[PDB]
Structure formats: structure tokens, C-alpha cells
């Protein structure tokens, strides 16, 4: 039930509200992104962060912000600069870092 | 079958042999290549270049070589550098021009 948990939960909710289509909602598969598992080395998504919150696996806001950033940086590497994904990713990285301070 | 028709028919078989899988054989579609026609404005491939050869549409070597470099370029733009796809185009492009010199 913890206070770090309470803070993380609301940064998540807030962060996820910027992803209407839940492009960042779930793990990415190779079926929907050919090459992905061999170009992205450490997967991250909003569904996966939700669960590390629930299991007290974040100990600091620092750790949580790290994975968020690892999620946008995976999308901005894999997706071409012109896509809904690369754009969305860059937007939310800068704004979500703005939000958490 | 004009003299220009014989030269180009020769250059074509020579190029298309550098591409054992057929990556270039046929026109790409957005079905197989998501958002392809919202980046590449003037699409190209071997099968099209063969059909113009037949049709006598190429009035010189220079114009055949422009289609080749069009089809090579198109691929380096669409595809990511780390891909099988971009690498064959980039290889085949510089070889091609030399071979046809």
C-alpha cells in the first residue's frame, strides 16, 4: 500500500493519459514489428511498469523515471522519425520528465 | 529488338543477379511495407524497369541508370540501415553504376 507506490501510481496514470491509442500499453511483438527483439535489447511498456509498481520493485522516483525514459528511447530507436510512434515517444519523454519534478 | 534493347536487357540480368531473393523484383505495397507510399513518391523495381525496356521507353543508357538509382535510393530511404534491405540497395547501387561504365 506504500507512499512510493501512491506517487508512482499517479505519475503512471498521468503518463498513460498521453497515449489514447495505448501504443505503449503492452509488450511489443516481432509479429507487429519485424526485427524488434534484435534491435531493442531491454523492452519496456506501461503495462510492464504498472506491475513493477504493484510488486514494490521501484525504490525511488529515479528508478521509475529510468524505465520510463528506457520505453521512449526504445520507440525512438526502432521507429522511423516520421511515424506516430517516434513522435509520440519524443513528446512524452520530455513532457513526462517535466511533469515528475 | 533495337540495339539499345539488347544492351539494357544485358545490364538488367547483370543487376537482378546481385539480388537472389527478389527484394527488388516487384513493386512494394503498403500491405507488406507499412506507410511505404507516404514516403516514396516515385516507386521502382526491376520488373517495371524490364517492362520499360521491352516497351522501348529508355532512349539511352543514362535513363536506364536513373531508374536503377531511383529504385536503390527509394529502398535506402524507406528501410533502416541495419536491414538486409538497405544494405543490398547500398551495395548494388555503387556496383551497378561501375558495371554500367
Amino acid at each position: 500500500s506504500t507512499p512510493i507506490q501512491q506517487l508512482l501510481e499517479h505519475f503512471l496514470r498521468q503518463l498513460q493519459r498521453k497515449d489514447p491509442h495505448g501504443f505503449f500499453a503492452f509488450p511489443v511483438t516481432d509479429a507487429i514489428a519485424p526485427g524488434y527483439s534484435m534491435i531493442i535489447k531491454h523492452p519496456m511498456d506501461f503495462g510492464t511498469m504498472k506491475d513493477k509498481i504493484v510488486a514494490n520493485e521501484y525504490k525511488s522516483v529515479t528508478e521509475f523515471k529510468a524505465d520510463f525514459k528506457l520505453m521512449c528511447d526504445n520507440a525512438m530507436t526502432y521507429n522511423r522519425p516520421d511515424t506516430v510512434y517516434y513522435k509520440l515517444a519524443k513528446k512524452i519523454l520530455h513532457a513526462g520528465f517535466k511533469m515528475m519534478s | 529488338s533495337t540495339p539499345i534493347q539488347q544492351l539494357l536487357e544485358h545490364f538488367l540480368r547483370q543487376l537482378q543477379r546481385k539480388d537472389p531473393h527478389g527484394f527488388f523484383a516487384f513493386p512494394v505495397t503498403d500491405a507488406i511495407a507499412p506507410g511505404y507510399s507516404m514516403i516514396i513518391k516515385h516507386p521502382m523495381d526491376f520488373g517495371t524497369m524490364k517492362d520499360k525496356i521491352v516497351a522501348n521507353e529508355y532512349k539511352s543508357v543514362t535513363e536506364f541508370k536513373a531508374d536503377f538509382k531511383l529504385m536503390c535510393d527509394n529502398a535506402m530511404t524507406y528501410n533502416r540501415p541495419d536491414t538486409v534491405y538497405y544494405k543490398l540497395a547500398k551495395k548494388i547501387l555503387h556496383a551497378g553504376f561501375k558495371m554500367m561504365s
Partner: peptide
């Protein structure tokens, strides 16, 4: 709608 050709 995501990715390259594969």
C-alpha cells in the same frame, strides 16, 4: 500499422 517490411 507499425514498423518496416518483414
Amino acid at each position: 500499422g507499425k514498423g518496416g517490411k518483414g
